[PDB]
C-alpha cells in the first residue's frame, strides 16, 4: 500500500459518498478508475518519490 495512492483514493471515496447528483457520480467513478489503474499508479508513485 502506497500512502499517497490511499490518501487520494480515500479523498475520492469521500466525494462519492457526499455528492449525490448523477454527473458527480459518473465523474467520481471515472476518477476512481483512473486512480485504480496500474499505469497511473506507477507514474504517480515515481513522480512522488522524486519530488
Amino acid at each position: 500500500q502506497d500512502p499517497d495512492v490511499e490518501d487520494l483514493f480515500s479523498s475520492l471515496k469521500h466525494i462519492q459518498h457526499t455528492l449525490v447528483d448523477s454527473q458527480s457520480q459518473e465523474d467520481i467513478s471515472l476518477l476512481l478508475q483512473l486512480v485504480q489503474n496500474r499505469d497511473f499508479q506507477n507514474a504517480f508513485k515515481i513522480h512522488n518519490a522524486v519530488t
Binding site: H14, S24, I28, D39, H47
Partner: protein, 58 residues
Amino acid sequence: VLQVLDRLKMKLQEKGDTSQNEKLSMFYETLKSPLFNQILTLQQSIKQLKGQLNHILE
C-alpha cells in the same frame, strides 16, 4: 480530465464541503505536471516494447 476535477471542486463548494479543496488542487497540479507527463509517456513506451517482446515469444 481537468474539467471533471474542476466541476467536482465547485459542487463541493456549493454544498459547503471544502475538505477536499487542497487535495483536488494537488491532484490537479500533478496531472498537469511536466514531470508527471514525461513519466507517463515514457512508461507507456516501455510498456509497448515489453508487449512487443511478449508477442515475439510465440
